């Protein structure tokens, strides 16, 4: 009985809720994306997330959503990798930010 998606690894923190979900790509809400090194990430796109800290500075390298830049995002409690914050590189994009949360990093399984 919950609407929330929590850190699989510590399960102490809610990251987002089902109602944040949207399809940025007409690939639906959650598609498989491949990183440059062969890691596939079923990344769910949500408008808002919380309890996440950022690593590094934003990059556009190999961005899965062109126009947006990624910044690594991890659990504030366990530091487990959760996904990325995506921030638009152009003023005319919408939204200006969302998050892409990796499926294998959340409970329940989506």
């Amino acid at each position: 009985p919950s609407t929330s998606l929590s850190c699989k690894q510590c399960q102490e923190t809610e990251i987002t809720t089902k109602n944040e979900i949207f399809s940025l790509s007409l690939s639906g809400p959650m598609a498989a994306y491949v990183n440059p090194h062969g890691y596939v990430h079923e990344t769910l796109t949500v408008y808002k997330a919380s309890n996440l800290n950022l690593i590094g500075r934003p990059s556009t390298e190999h961005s899965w959503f062109p126009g947006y830049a990624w910044t690594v995002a991890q659990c504030k409690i366990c530091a487990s990798h959760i996904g990325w914050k995506f921030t638009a590189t152009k003023k005319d994009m919408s939204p200006q930010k969302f998050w892409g949360l990796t499926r294998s990093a959340l409970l329940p399984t989506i």
């Binding site: 690894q9 990183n35 090194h37 890691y39 690593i55 590094g56 990059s59 390298e61 190999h62 990624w70 690594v72 991890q74 366990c78 530091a79 487990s80 990798h81 990325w84 990796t102």
Partner: peptide, 26 residues
């Protein structure tokens, strides 16, 4: 930051941050 994580793209200045991070992917 010359240390990069192949899994997610995190970059680090210190080797030791990388090690910490990579362990968590386990």
């Amino acid at each position: 930051r010359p240390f990069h994580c192949n899994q997610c793209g995190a970059s680090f200045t210190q080797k030791g941050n990388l090690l910490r991070h990579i362990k968590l992917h386990s």
